[PDB]
Design goal:
This is part of a larger assembly, with chains A (117 residues), B (7 residues), C (70 residues), D (153 residues) and E (66 residues). Chain B has 7 residues and is mostly loops. Helices cover 0% and strands 0% of the residues of chain B. Chain C is mostly helical and 70 residues long. Chain C has one domain. With 153 residues, chain D is mostly helical. In chain D, helix 2 crosses helix 3. Chain E has four helices and no strands. The longest helix of chain E is centred in the last third of the chain and has 16 residues. Chain E has one domain. The chains are: A alpha/beta (117), B little secondary structure (7), C mainly alpha (70), D mainly alpha (153), E mainly alpha (66). The interface between A and D is small, with 8 and 9 residues. The complex binds potassium ion and magnesium ion (MG) (17 copies). Chain D binds two RNA strands through helix 4. Chain A: Keywords: Methylation, Ribonucleoprotein, Ribosomal protein, RNA-binding, rRNA-binding. Chain A: One of its GO terms (biological process) is translation. Chain A: Part of the 30S ribosomal subunit. Interacts with proteins uS7 and bS18. Cross-links to IF-3. In stalled ribosomes contacts ribosome rescue factor SmrB. Chain A: This is Small ribosomal subunit protein uS11.
RNA sequence: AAGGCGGCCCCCUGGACGAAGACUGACGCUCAGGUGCGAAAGCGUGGGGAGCAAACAGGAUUAGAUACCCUGGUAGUCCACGCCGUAAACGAUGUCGACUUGGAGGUUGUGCCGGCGUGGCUUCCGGAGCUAACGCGUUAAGUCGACCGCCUGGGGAGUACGGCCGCAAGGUUAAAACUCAAAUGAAUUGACGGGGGCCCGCACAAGCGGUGGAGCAUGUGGUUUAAUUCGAUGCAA
RNA sequence: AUGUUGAUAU
């Protein structure tokens, strides 16, 4: 609706799933897409390809706002870290920054117990 | 079991 | 890690420089480490084992340099 | 095989048109070593196709193959019980091999009178993208695109 | 490698000397290993204490993202 | 000292080490009983409770699944004070002292001028010697001395009974009958592994044609018979 | 992911 030239892409690349939210620089969400939303479930959902498609659909979601340049904020260890960023570049945008914003505690809280698979 | 083997 | 894409830089190059920065800071390794709790005994055992590997490498590495295979 | 010292065996070209592509088609059609029988069915069928198109025999055959030839296919890799159908590019030799095999398989399950007719009709449907052979090509492409995720290992 | 603090013959690393301390942190703000910088163990311990004092006084950052 | 101890700052405080002397003058070593400290879990009283998580619940998986996996989740994990007194509390190696070839480090003092010494603690290798062997090897499992603790086939049993301790959980001290001809350590050759590596075979894959259904031939099993002669009967009848 | 068992003596 209201035009935003300069935006921020946030990539929540978990092991199971990739969420791409494009916000403005004040962190207000304009649109989003997920690998899970984009016709991939289970094994396929957690692929770089499913994240690629999620990124494309997120670009289409924010076509109206007229975003030109993006700062990328990458989070988490997932498959869809780099494939997401390539896709946002491939879908028009000028990538100005790339920044890892993965939370790391400086010690923090005891993680869950190891899985005995 | 089998009321008591290897075949 | 925090890449400014500099003026007159290909994205592909800048992305490679981001991968470098993350692998240098060791973000993914840090995440995988902290995914599950490691008991202190487990932590200590792997630290010991890693040291012994590197040592038993170093000594036996020199042995390979000396002796002929053929 | 393991040692993997397998070239290509010398296929003699067909007598009529001198096409090794068509010589392979006869082989794929042939049963019980009855090559003479197979050649007659093909040449009969190509004649019929050449009339209905007015394209030439080999050229009408090429249009049939062009539509039935696959580009990608899936190969099964089992990963922890579940079966990952990984898409792979088909090599040019295998493209023709699959194209021809599908056409003959399609023709054989038709309910026309002779094989030569069944074959002519299937090549005709292939050229206009209607028959079971192009449906097979579509199905193979469908699975490949469905499993495009697993291509990028 | 080689240790600058042995070379100069320093007594304390000093938390106030930010120009020096900045050489022994990463871009991320993390303290660099002695195996990388070639610092002597004794000074590495002093340097860590100095960096941690500086981080408290907000002369150095804790991390790249504040 | 052991258990253990990890952001930064201050306060109180213990030990170790080194260099120069000076001082006391065998004041030492060990130590049954005794006393203290002693991970985690646990217990009591009062706090706290983010994250995690016995129990528990649900979802899966499965023949079942009172599990592993998933979603939750209470005690607990945290603090104060008190209790418990045990751990593969391990170097499975008691303490103290002396002596006996080397090499490469780490760490922390120090002397002489980057080198050359000299102390402390420590990691790895290895010589003699020792050892059943594995290995240990100046930080000994070598060579000796002092004192203490402890063992005497496997099981029954670290159990019973009694005592002591404990709020309890239990701890601690600690038998017997009975039963067996073993149980055990280290190493050796194999074999095996849902261990690793490297290879091969129509072993998979890629294909083509079959078998399993039909009728018949034929063999076998079974049943039947007076007899249905005897043998072959996973692959390899 | 899971994925049990193999009568006695010789
Ligand atoms: K049973
Ligand atoms: Mg989890
Ligand atoms: Mg005593
Ligand atoms: Mg406790
Ligand atoms: Mg309590
Ligand atoms: Mg309470
Ligand atoms: Mg759980
Ligand atoms: Mg004990
Ligand atoms: Mg012991
Ligand atoms: Mg040794
Ligand atoms: Mg008892
Ligand atoms: Mg008692
Ligand atoms: Mg096969
Ligand atoms: Mg049959
Ligand atoms: Mg018989
Ligand atoms: Mg006989
Ligand atoms: Mg017999
Ligand atoms: Mg078994």
């Amino acid at each position: 609706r209201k035009q935003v030239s300069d935006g921020v892409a946030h990539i929540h690349a978990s092991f199971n799933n990739t969420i791409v939210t494009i916000t403005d620089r004040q962190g207000n969400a304009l649109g989003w897409a997920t690998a899970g939303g984009s016709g991939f479930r289970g094994s396929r959902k957690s692929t770089p390809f499913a994240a690629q498609v999620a990124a494309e659909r997120c670009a289409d979601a924010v076509k109206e706002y007229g975003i030109k340049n993006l700062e990328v904020m990458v989070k988490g260890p997932g498959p869809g870290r780099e494939s997401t960023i390539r896709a946002l570049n491939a879908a028009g945008f000028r990538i100005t920054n790339i920044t890892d914003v993965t939370p790391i505690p400086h010690x923090g809280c005891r993680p869950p117990k190891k899985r005995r698979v | 079991x089998x009321a008591x083997x290897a075949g | 890690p925090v890449i400014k894409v500099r003026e007159n830089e290909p994205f592909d190059v800048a992305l490679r420089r981001f991968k470098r920065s993350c692998e240098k800071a060791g973000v993914l390794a840090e995440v995988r480490r902290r995914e599950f709790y490691e008991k202190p005994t487990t932590e200590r055992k792997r630290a010991k084992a890693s040291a012994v590997k590197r040592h038993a490498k170093k000594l036996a590495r020199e042995n390979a340099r000396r002796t002929r295979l053929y | 095989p393991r040692r993997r010292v397998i070239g290509q065996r010398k296929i003699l070209p067909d007598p009529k048109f001198g096409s090794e592509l068509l010589a392979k088609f006869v082989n794929i059609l042939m049963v019980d070593g009855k090559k003479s029988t197979a050649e007659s069915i093909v040449y009969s069928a190509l004649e019929t196709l050449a009339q209905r198109s007015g394209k030439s025999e080999l050229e009408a055959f090429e249009v049939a193959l062009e539509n039935v030839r696959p580009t990608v296919e899936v190969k099964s890799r089992r990963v922890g019980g579940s079966t990952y159908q990984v898409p792979v590019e088909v090599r040019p030799v295998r493209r023709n091999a699959l194209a021809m095999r599908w056409i003959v398989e399609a023709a054989r399950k038709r309910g026309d009178k002779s094989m030569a007719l069944r074959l002519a009709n299937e090549l005709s449907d292939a050229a206009e993208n209607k028959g079971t052979a192009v449906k097979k090509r579509e199905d193979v492409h469908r699975m490949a695109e469905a499993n495009k995720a697993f291509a990028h290992y | 490698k080689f240790c600058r603090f042995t070379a100069e013959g320093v007594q304390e690393i000093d938390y106030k000397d930010i120009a020096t301390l900045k050489n022994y942190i990463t871009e991320s703000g993390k303290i660099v290993p002695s195996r990388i910088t070639g610092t002597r163990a004794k000074y590495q311990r002093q340097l860590a204490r100095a960096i941690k004092r500086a981080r408290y006084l907000s002369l150095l950052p804790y991390t790249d993202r504040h």
